[model samples]
Target chain A: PTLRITEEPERDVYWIHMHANLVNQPGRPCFASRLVDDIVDYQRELGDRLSASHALSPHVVLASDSDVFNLGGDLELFCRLIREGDRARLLDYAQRCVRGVHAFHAGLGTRAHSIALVQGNALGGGFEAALSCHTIVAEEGVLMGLPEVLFDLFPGMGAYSFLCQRISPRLAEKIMLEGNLYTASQLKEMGLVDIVVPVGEGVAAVEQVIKESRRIPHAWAAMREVNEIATMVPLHEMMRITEIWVDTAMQLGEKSLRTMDRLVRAQ
Target chain B: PTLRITEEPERDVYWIHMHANLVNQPGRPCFASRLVDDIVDYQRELGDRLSASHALSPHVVLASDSDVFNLGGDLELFCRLIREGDRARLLDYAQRCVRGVHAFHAGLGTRAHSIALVQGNALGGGFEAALSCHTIVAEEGVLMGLPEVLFDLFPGMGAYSFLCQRISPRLAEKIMLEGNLYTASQLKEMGLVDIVVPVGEGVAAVEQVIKESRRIPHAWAAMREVNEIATMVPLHEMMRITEIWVDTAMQLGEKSLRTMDRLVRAQ
Candidate 1:
C-alpha cells in the first residue's frame, strides 16, 4: 500500500500515513515524483470532502506507515534519466515534484493546520514533506534531515526556506552545507518541531495541537493569508534555484555513480 | 563642588563624576539647579572640544565621588516655593532643569555613547538623570526609580519618557501609577538597566564598556546622526505630554498638595 488515510470527523482532523517501499524494493528506483503527486491528490480530495461537510477548517496529521518515510526522489530514476540523455524530462520532473511539495505547504497553510508525526527515519524528501506542516510532532528517537549532499546534489524541495525559518541562519547554513542529521531533541531546541512525543504518542499529541488551534479567532483564515504572503516570493525563488540544480545534475551524468563507488569503497 | 569632567583624547571618551555633598547646606537652596547647569555646560564644552579635535564620536561615563549619588531635587526648596506662592519661578526652574537633562540626552546620542555608573540611592530627579543614558550599570542592592508619583505630583522632569523607553507600556503604567522603588536586579530584568555589578566594581565595569565601544566602526559620526534623528519625535511628544500634566496639577492645587505631603511623610 502506498498510502493510508484515517479521518477523525469528531476531532475535525485527518491522519495520513505514507508507505513508500522504494528503498527496499529490488530495483531501488526513485519514486519521489509519483509519491508526491499521490499525496497532493489525496490532500485535494480531503479538502473537497471537508468543504462539503461545512467544515472550513480541518487539521491534518502526516505520518509514515513504514519504518522510514519518503527518502526524497529515487536516485536510480535520476541515474536512468542521465543514461537516456533526457535533460528536459529531468528538469520537468524536478519542477513537478517541487510544485507538489509547494501545494502541500500551501494547502496546510490554507484549509487547516497540519502537523507531522515522525516515528522513524525521515530523510531528504521525507524531511521536506514533514516541514510543510505548520507544526511537527516527532518521536524521541526519530532521525530527520537532508542527506542529499552525499550524492553531489542538494535538497531540491523547500529545504532552504524551511530550515532557515526553523533555526538560526548560522545553524541553517551548517545543516545545508554539511547535510547533517538532527535528533528530535536538537530540532526542539531550534524551535522547528513544536512537540516531541514518546514512541507511540505522536499522533495523539498532534490531535491536542489541532484542538488548541481551533480556540483561536479566525485561526485558519489568518494563517492562510499570512502564509500566502510570506511564501510566495521564496517559493518562486526556490523553484528557479532548484531548476538550475536539476540542469546541472543532468550534465554531470556519471558523477553519482563514481560517488557511490567511493562511498562503498570507504565503508 | 559640582561636576568636573575630564576627557581621554586617545580613546575619545569622557568621564564626569558627581562631586557635591548632597546634604542640605544653609543658604544653598538652589544647589541642585547649579549642579545641573554645571553638568550641562560641561557636556556642551565637551561637544565643542570633540568637534574641534575632529573626533566627533566620544563616549561618556557618569562616575560619582559623593557617598550618595544624588538625593534628588532640594525638597526644602520645593517647600519654600510652595509656602511663598512662587509658582511661576518654581515651574520655570523645573522646566529649565529638565531641558538641561534633555540637552544632555540629545548630545550623547549625537557625538557619543553614554553609560551611567550608579552606586547609591538614585531617587526622583536623580533617577531620571540616570535613565537618560543609553546604558545604566548599577551595583547590586542599589535602590532605583521615581517615588514622586506617591507624592501625588508626578516626576515634573522627563521621567515619563525615560520610564516608557526602559520598560514596557503596561509595566511603565504600573510603576508611575504606584510610585515603586525597584532593586537593581529587578530593573535589569525590566530592561531599565543593562548590567549590574558589585558595589566597588561599577567604575571598572563602565570602563570595560568604554573600552569595548572604542572598537566600534565610525562610532562618533554614526551615533551622533542616529541619536539626533531617533530622539526627535519621542522627546517632542514627551515634552508636550509633560506640559499637560503640569497644567492639570496647577489646576488641582489642594489634591496635589495633599499627595506631596503624603509622599514626603512616607519617605
Candidate 2:
C-alpha cells in the first residue's frame, strides 16, 4: 500500500498520508496507478470503518508525507497510454481518479468532514482533490494549481466542477486556462482555501478548526450537509465531463505530447 | 400576458421586459403563477425564434418596466397554498420557476447570451432570475437579496445553485440566511453583480458591453459556452433540490405562515 493511515482517537481525526515508493523524491509525489488504487481502496474500507467506529464526529484529513502534496496525474503513464492508443485504460485511470476524489467529496458515505492539509505544492489532480474536501487548510508557503493546460488539456477529474463550486465560472476558467501556480495566501484570498497556517502548524490548524466546530456540532454538521447539497456536482455530471476530458486527451497533437514529456522530466 | 418583448435588429438584442398587471404598484413586482407562465412560455418560443431568426449572435435581455425589477415570489399565494396543504401545486409552482430560470441560465438553448439589467430593486425570485443570466448589470441604488429565509424558507428556485455559480458556497449561504438587502455596489463587490452603473445608465451600460463583446465574437462566445458547461447545475439536480424545497415549504408552521403574509403586504 502507498498510504500510511493512523487514527487520533481523542480528536477522532484520521490521517491518510501519501507514502509512495519515492517518498523522499526531489519532486512532488505523483499518483501512480498503485497510489490511486490504494486511496480508492482506503476510502472504500473507510465507509465500514466509520459505521463501526465509536467516534461521534470524525475528521478525515488527507495530506502527503513528501515535500509536495502531489504533482498530479502520472504523466509518464499518461503518455505511454496515449501513445499506445489505449483509450480504455486512459478512461479507466480517469474514472478511478474520479472515484477517489468523489469519496472525499461525498465524505466517505458518512457525516465525517473531509479536510485537506496541504503543506506543500499541489498541482492538477492534486489541487482538484484538495478542492473536493469539506475544508482546505494549506500552509502559508504551499503552492497549488491546475497545470494540465500546459499539456494542451484540462484537469479532467473534477477541477472545473469543483472549482466552479467555490468560485465564479469565469474565474474558474481563467485559472484552468492560465495554468499558473498560486500561493496559499492568494488561493485563500480567492476563496478557495479555507485556512492558511504556518508550515509546521498545518495539522495543528485543522485540529483547532475541528475543536471549534465541535462546540456547535449539530448546526455545524447540518450546515455542512446543506452546503453539500447546495454545491453538489452530481456523479452524472462528473462522469460526462470525464468523457469529454478523455476525448480531449486523445486529440493532443505532437507539440502537446512533447510538452507533456518535458513536464514529466521537470517534475 | 405579463411580458413585453421586442427586438433591436440592428444590435441583435431581444428585450424581455416584465409587464405584469398592477405595473404601477408602489412596491417591487411579484412573481405570480401567471407571470411565471408567461416567462416560461416566452422561452419555449424563444428557442424556435433563435433557430428561424437572422440575428448573428443574439443577446437576450431580461429586465422589468416597473421601478423594482422584481419583488420575488407571490407570498399571498404561498401562504394560501401552504394553509391548504397544497403540496402538489406548490411543487408545480417551484418547478415552473426553475424552468423559467433554467432557460435564462442555459441561454434559451441557443448561442444567445442572457443579460439582466437590474434598474431597480430585485428580491427573492427576482434576484434568482437575474442571477440566472450570463451577465448582470445593475444601476446604482438598486437593492437585491434573497429574503425567503425570513419566513424560515430559502430561495429554492435557483438562488443557491446560481449564487454558487457566481460566488463561494459559504458566502452564498450567508447571503441566503441573512435575508438582508444589499446595494448594487455591495453586490458588485461581492462578485454577484457583474457591473454597476449610474442610476439611469443601466441600459446604456449593457449596450456598451454587448458592443465590446462583438469585437471578439468567437472567443467571447466560446468562453461563455465553456463557462455554461463548466458551471451548469443540471436539471436533475435542480428538480431534486426543488423537491427538497417543496417538502420544506410544506412543513412551515403557523408562525412562518404569518411571516409570509406580513412580507406580502410589506412588499
Candidate 3:
C-alpha cells in the first residue's frame, strides 16, 4: 500500500496516510509516482467490503505525508510513458485513478462516508482525491491546486466532476487552466474544502465531526445515500475524460516534462 | 400575492420579495396553504419566462422580509395538519416546497441564475428555501439553520439536497439534526453561503456579482448549465424524500406539536 491504513473501531473510522514523494532520497521514488496503482488496489479491497452487507467502519479519512498531500501523477512514470509513447499504460494508470477516486467519491459505493484530512499541500490528483470525498477538514495555510495544466495535461481524473459539484464550473475551469496554489481558507471560501481549521488542528476538527455524526447516524446514512443518488457521476464518464487525459499526456513534449521535472524538484 | 415581484431591468435581474405571506388565507382551502404553493408558482412564473426563447433578465434574486429572511415552514399550518392527520396535505406542502427549491436549485430552470439574498434570520423551511438557491449572499450577523429535528421532523424539502451539494452529506445531516443556528461567517466557513457581506451590504454584493457575471455572461450561462448537469438532484428523488418527510411529520402526536407551537410563537 502506498498509503498506511489505520482502523479505530471505537469511533468507527479508518485513518489513512499517504506519502507519495520521498523527495530525492537516495533510494526513494519521487513526485511523478501516482497513487493510481495503490489507489486502485486500495479501493478494490474497500469496494469488495463496501458491496457486502456491512462495512468495517462508517468513515475513512484520506491524509498525507510530510507537508504535501500528494504530488499527483508520477512524472517519472509519465516521462517514461511519454517518451516511449506508452498510451495503453498511461490510459491504464488513469483508469486505475478513476476507480480509486470514484471509490472515495462514493465512500467505496456503500453506506460508508469518506473524509479527507489535509494538513499540507494537496496538489493535482491529491486535490482531486480530497475533492472526491464527502468532507474535507484541512489545516489553514496548506497549498492546494490542480497543477496538471502546468504540464500541458489536465486533471481529468474527476477534477472537473468533483469541482463542479462543489463550486461553479466556470471557476473550476479557470482554476485548472490557471494552475494557481490556494490556501485552506481560500479554498474553503471557494466551496471546495468543507471545513478549515487553524494550522495543526485538522485532526481535531475531523474527530469532532465524527463524534457529532454518531448522534445521528441514521440521518448521516440517509444523506450519504441521497448525495450519491443526487450527485451521480458515472465511472464511464470519468473514464471517457481519462481517455482524453491519456491523449493529452501522450502529446506532452520534452518542454512539459521538463516543467514537471522542475515542479518535482521544487517539491 | 404575498410577494412583490419587481422588474429590476436596470441590471437585467428580477428582484422578488416575500412579505407577511400566509399559506392558507381565509379564502384559501383547508388543503390550501400554498405558502409552499405560492413559492412554487412564483418560481414557475420566473422559470417559465427564463426558459422562453426570447431574451429576458439573466438573473433572479430571492430576497425576504427585512431583518428576517424567513421563519421556515408555516408552523401553524403544520400543527393544523398534524392534529387533523392530513397526510396528503402535508406531503403536498413539502412537494410544493420541493418544486420551488428545485427551481431555485436549478437557477429557475432557465439560462438565468438564482441568488438568495438573506439579510436576516432564516430558520426551518425558510433556511431550506435559502439553501436551495445556486448562491447565497448573507449579512454578517444573520443566523440560519434547520430546526425540524427539534420537532420530530426533518427539513423534508431540499435542505439535505442543497447542503450536500455545497459541502458534505455528513456535515449536512449533522446540521439538520443539531438544529443549531449558525452565524453567516460560520456558514461561509462551512461552504454553505457563497458570500458574506457587511451588516447591510448583501444587495450590493449581489449587484456586484451580477455585473461581474454580466461581463462573462457566456461563462455564467455555461456555469449554470454545467453545474446543473454535473451535480443534478433528480426531481423524483427529492419527491420521494418529501414523502418520507411527510410520513415522519404525521407521527408528531401532541408533544411535538406543542414544540412547534412554541417555536412558531418564538418566531
Candidate 4:
C-alpha cells in the first residue's frame, strides 16, 4: 500500500500517513498518477467520515513517512501522456488530483481545526496537502515547495490559491517559478508553517495547537459565514483560470519535450 | 473635559483617553459625537507631527476611562431627532458618526504602530474603537462588544467590517445581535485582543508593544503598501455592507425611537 491510516483515539484525532516510493522506482516509472485512483478512493472515504462526524469534531492530523511529501503528478505519467498524445486522460487525471486536494482542504476548512505533521520532504502536491491544513508543524529537516515549473508545468492541486493566502505572492512566485526548496525553519519564519519541531515531534506540536483551537470562544460562526460569502466570488474565477491553463499546458509543442528532457538531465 | 491626552516620554507613545459623562443629560447631549470629532482632530495633528519628526519614534495608544468607552453616537441627539421627526439631521449625524469611525480605523490602520489599552468596559462603539488598532491589549476585568442591536439600532461605526476581519463574523453577530459582552481573556481567545494583562498593567503592557513597533523590519512605505493590498479589499467590501445596513436602519423610525427610549431609561 502506498499510504496508511492510523487513529489516535486516546488523543481524539485521526492521522493519515502517506508513503510513496518515487525515487526508488525502476525505469521511467509513473509514481503519483499510478496511485491517483487509489488516493482518490481513499480520500473519498475520508471525506465521508469527516462530513459524517461534523457534529462530533472537525479536526484531523495528516502525517507523512516518505522523504518527500509528494513529488506531484508523476512526471513519468506526463511523459507517457505526451508521447501517446492522450490529452483527455492527462486533463482528467490532473482534475482528479486537483479535486482530491480541494476536497481535503474543503473538509478541513469546515473543521474548527486541523493540523499537518511533516516529517520529511513536502514538495509539489505534497506541499499542497500541507497547505490544506489549518496549522502545519514540520520536522526541522523537511524541505517544502512546488517544483512543477521545472517540468514546463505549474502547480495544479490548489497550490496557487493556498500559497497566495498563506504567504505573499512574491514569495509564492519565487518558490514556484524558481523551484526553490525551503527549510522547515525558513517556512516557519515566513509564517507558512506554524511550528518547526524535531523529527517525530511534529505530532505533539500539532496536538498542542488543536487543544488551543478548542478554546476559541463562540465557534466564530459569523466569521465563517462572511468568509464563505467573500471567497465564493474569487474561487469561481480561479476554477475557470485553472481549467484554461491546464488545457494550454497539454497543448505544448516539441519545445515542451526539449524542456522536459533538459529538466530530467539536469536533475 | 470630553477627552484627555497623556504622553509617556520614556515609551515615546501618546495615550488618547476618551470619556463621555453627558449621557445623564435628558436632551441635546452630543458628548460622544463631539468626542469622536476631537479624537479625529488629535490623530490628524499627531499624524503630521510624526511625519515631520521623521522620528518614527512615537506611536499612538487609545484608552478610555471608567466603565463605558464612548457608548457610540450621542443617542440623546438621535432621540431628539426622532421626537422632532428631523430625518435629515438624524441621517447626517449618523453619517458623521460613520465617517468618524471610518477615519479612525483608517488612521490607526495607517499608523506604523498603535495599540488599544482596554481596562473596564469597551461596549458598542467602544469595542469598534479598540479593533481599529494594529494591536489590542486589554485588562482582565475589561468587557467589550457592539450592543447596538439591543437598542434596536445597529452600530453606526464601520464596526462590523473590522470585527469580521479581526474576529469571526459568528462572534461579531453574537455581540451585535445578542448584545454579548466578552471579557478581555475571552477576546484574546477569539483573536480580537492580542494580549490580556492585569488591570494595573494595561497601560504598561501596551507601552511594551509600542516600544517594539520600532523594531519592525521593513520601512514605513513598504509596510503601508503591502498592508493596503492585503487588507483594503475586505475592508472596502465590509464598509459597503455597513453603509447599506445603516441606511436600512434609518428607515425604521419606530424601532429607532424604542432604542432611544431604552437608552434614556438606562441612563
Candidate 5:
C-alpha cells in the first residue's frame, strides 16, 4: 500500500497517512503512480459510502507520515516521459492528478469537507493539492510554492484555478511565474492558508477546525453552501487547462528537462 | 450626447470623455441607457475598423469630464424595472453592460490595448469597468468599490470576474461582501491598480505607459499576449455568473429595494 487509512470514529475524521514509498528512492516523498492509484482507490471507496449511514461522519484529512508533506510531482517520471515523446502518457498522469484534486475540492459530492494538514514542505503539484482543500492547516515555517517556472512551465493541474479562487489572478500568476517559496505565515496573511500552528501541532489545528464546525453546525454548513456557490471553480475549466499543461510539457526543450532532472536528484 | 470622443492620431490614443447627462436629474453621473447605447455603438464601429490600416493606431481610454468617474448602474431605472417586474428589461440592460465591458477587457479583439483612466470616484459598475481594462491609471485619492451588497444585491456585471483576474479570489469576495470603499493607493498595494498618480496627473501616467510600450515594442507585445493567455477570463463564464446575479437581484426584499431607493436619492 502506498498509504494507510485510519478513522477517528469519535471525532468524525478520516485520515490518509502518506508513506511516500518510491522504493527505488524510498526516502523521497513524491506522488508516484502507486501513491496516485492508492489515493484514487481511497476516494472511490469513500464515494461508495455516500448512500449509507456510517457511525462516523466523513471529513477527509490528507496528511503525511514523513516530515515533508510532499516534494510534488514525480519528476523522474516526468523526465523519462519527456525523453520518450509520449504525450499520451504525460496527459494521462496529469488527468489523474486533476481528477483527484477536483473531487477533493468539490467535497466528494458534498459528503465531506476536505482538509489539508501540511506539516512540511509542499511544492509544485504538492502545493496545488493543498490549495484544492476546503481548508488548509499548516505548521509554522512550512515552505510552500509552485517551482514549475524553474523548469519553464506552469503548475497546470489546479494551481491557477484553486489559487484564483483563494487569491487574485494577478498574484496567482505572479506566484506561478516567479516560482518563489513562501512560508506558512506569509501565506496566511495572503489569504491562502486557513490556519497555521507551531511545529508539531498541525494535527491539533485540524481538530480545532472540526470541533468548531460541530459547535456551529448550522452556520458552518450554510457558509459552506454559500462558498460552494460564490467561489465556484468549474471542473471542466480545470480539465481544459490540463490540456494546455500537457501541450506545454511536450514542448519542453532539453535544457528545461535538464532542470527537472536536477530537481529530481535534489529530491 | 452623453459622451464626446477625440482621437490623438499623433500618439495613437482614442478617448471617451463621459458627460454624465441624466435628463431628469442632470447632475448624477450614472450609466443611463443613452450612455450604454453610445458605448455599444462605439465598440461596434471600432470593431469594424479591425480590417483597416489607419495611420492612427487605436488604443481606447475611458475617462470622465466630471469629478466622479461613474456612479455605476442607473439605480432609478433599476428601481423602476424591478417595481414593474420587468425581468426581461433588467437582463437586457445587464447583457449590454457585459458585452461592452467584455470587449474592452479583450482589447477590442487585439486591435488596441484598453485602459481605464480614473480621475475621480468609481463605484459599483464603474469600478468593474475600470478593472476590465488592461491597466487602471487612477488619481491618487480616487475612491472605488462595489456597493451593491449594501442593498442586498451584488455587482453581477463583471466585478468578481475582473477582480479575480487582478487579485486573489478571497480578497475579491471580501471586498464585494463588505461593500467598503478603497483608495487608489490602497488598491495599488492590494495588486489591483496598475498605476496611481497625483490627482491632476492621471492623464500623464497613461501617456507614460503608452510611451514605454512603444519604446519596448517586442517585449511589451509578447508580455501582453502572454498575459492574455495566462489571465484569460472567458466570456461564457462571466455571462453565467450574471445569470446568478440577475436571479439574486430579482429576489431582493422590499426592505432591500427601499435601501436602493435611498441610495438613488442620495446620488
Candidate 6:
C-alpha cells in the first residue's frame, strides 16, 4: 500500500501518511497516484465508521514526508502525456487529482473535520491539499506556493476552488496569477493558514484543534456547513475548471515543458 | 436622541453618531430599544436620500463615543422579559435587533457603503453591528466579543452571518463559540477589522480609508459587492437564524439569565 493510514484513537484523530512509488523514475513518489489513492481510501474508511458506539467522527490529518508535500502534480507523467499529445490521458490524470482534492475538501462528505498538518515545504498540489481542509496547522517557516504560472499553466485541480472558499475570490485570483511562494506566516496573514505552530509541533497543533473541536462540536459543525454553502463550491464548477486545465495542458510548448523540468529538479 | 445624522454634501458621505442615554455609561445603549429602531430607520432614510440626490451613493459611517462604541443588547430588558417568560415581546425585541444588523450589513441595499468606528467596547449585538459594516475602523485595544455564550445563548442577531461574511464560516463559528473578548489588532489578525489606528487616531485612520476609497474609482464598492456576493449571505438566511436565536434565548436557564442581569448593571 503506497498510502499509510494510522489510527490514533487516543487523540480521536487518524493520520494518513502519503507514499507513492514510481519504479521507472527511481526516487520520485508523486502524490499523483499513490497519495490520491490513499486519500480516497482513507475517506472511504471514514464513511464506514459512520454509525458506531463512539462514532468515528475523529478528525483526519493529511500528512506527507521529508520536507516536501509531493511536488504538485505528476509533471513527469503530464510532460510525457502532453508531449505525446495524449489529451485524454492528461485529462484523466487531472480528473483523478480533482477527485482526490474534492473529497479532501468535502471531508469525505462527513461530519469528521479535516486538518492539513504541514511540516515542510508544501508546493503546488501540496499547497492545494493543505488548503482543502477546514483547519491548516502549519509549522513555522515552511514555504508554500503554486508555481504553475512559470510554466505558462495554472494549478487546475482545486486551487481556485479552495482559495476562493477560504478567503475571497479576488485574492484567490491574485494568488493564482502571481505565482509567488510565501512563508507560513505570510500565508497566515493572507487568511490561508489556520494555525501556525512552532516547528515540529504540527501534531500538537492538531491536538489543540481537536480539543477545541470536542469542546464545541455542534457550533463548529454549523459553521462548517455555513462556510461550505457560503462558497457555493459545487463539484460541477470544479469539473468545468478541470476541463479548461486539460485544454491548457495540451497547449504546452517545448520551452514551457523545459521550465516544468527545471522545477521538477528542485523537488 | 442618541443618533447625530450629518450629510456632507461636498464629500457625498453621510455620518451617524450613536450617543444615546448615558454619559457615564456610553455605548450603543442596549437598554434603549427605541434607539436601535432609530438606527434602523436612519438607514432606511438614507436609502430614500439616494433617490433624490443624484443617487449620491454616499458612504455611511456609524460613529460613536470615543470611550465606548457599543456595549451589546439591552440585558436589563432581556432579563426582565426572560424572568416573566414574555417570549412574544422578547422575539419582537430580537427581530428589531436583526433588522438593524441586517440593514447595516446590506449597505441598506444601496450603492452606498457602511463603516463602523469602534473606538471602545463592542459587545454582543454591538460587535455584531460593527462587523456588519463594509469596513471597521477600530482604535487599538478596542474590546469586542459575543458574550451570549456566557448567558447560554448565542449572538443570534447576525453575529454568525456577519462573521462568516467577513472571514470563513469555521473561524466565525470558533470566534462566536469561544465567547471571549479580543482586541482590535487580534481580531484584525482574524480578518475582521479593516483598519486599526492608535487609541486616539481613529479619525485619521477613517480619513485614510476614505482617501483610498476615493482614489480607487469608488475603490471599495465593487470589491465590497464581490465580498458580499461571494459569501452568499442572503437576507432570509439571516432572518431564519435570528428566529432560531429567539428560540434558544428562551431556553436560557435562570442562573445564566441572572449572570446577564449583573452584566446589565455594568452596562
Chain A (alone) TM-scores for all candidate structures: 0.85, 0.93, 0.90, 0.80, 0.93, 0.90
Q: Using DockQ as the measure, which candidate wins?
A: 6
Off by over 4 Å in 4: A8-12, A20-31, A50-57, A108-112, A217-226, A231-235, A251-267, B1-63, B66-128, B133-267
- TM-score each candidate: 0.52, 0.57, 0.65, 0.56, 0.61, 0.72
CAPRI quality band, candidate 1: incorrect
lDDT of each: 0.65, 0.81, 0.74, 0.62, 0.78, 0.74
Which structure among the candidates has the greatest TM-score?
A: 6
Decreasing lDDT order of the candidates: 2, 5, 6, 3, 1, 4
lDDT of 1 by residue, A81-145 (tens): 87898978887777776765666566543457677888777777678877877778898877888
Q: Is candidate 2 or candidate 5 better by TM-score?
A: 5
The docking category that best describes candidate 5 is incorrect
- Measured by lDDT, the strongest candidate is 2
Model 1 stretches with alpha carbons more than 4 Å out: A1-217, A220-267, B21-31, B51-57, B80-88, B103-111, B218-233, B248-267
Candidate 3: lDDT of A263? Answer: 67
lDDT of 3 by residue, A44-122 (tens): 6766755663653378888876556766667767767889997887787778878887888776766677888887778
Per-residue CA lDDT of candidate 1, range B1-267, in tens?
576567677877778887544444432222266777777777777777776776644787775666655556655556557666667766666666666557556654345667788887788777777877766889999988777665566775777676654445577668776778889888887667778988789877887877655533232233234224322325566557656655644554655666655545543
Model 4, A160-265: lDDT tens digits are: 6767655556876777788788899988877687688887776677777666544331232233334455542244544664676567666767777677666555
Specify the poorest-scoring 10-residue window by lDDT in model 3 chain B: B23-32
How much is the lDDT of residue A22 in candidate 1? Answer: 39
RMSD of each: 12.7, 8.6, 8.0, 11.3, 8.7, 6.1
**lDDT by residue (tens digit), candidate 2, A115-138:** 898988999889998998878999
Alpha carbon lDDT of residue B48, candidate 6? 70
Residue A173 error, candidate 2, Å: 16
**10 residues in a row with least lDDT, candidate 1 chain B:** B217-226
DockQ of each: 0.02, 0.11, 0.14, 0.06, 0.14, 0.19
lDDT score of residue B144 within candidate 6: 90
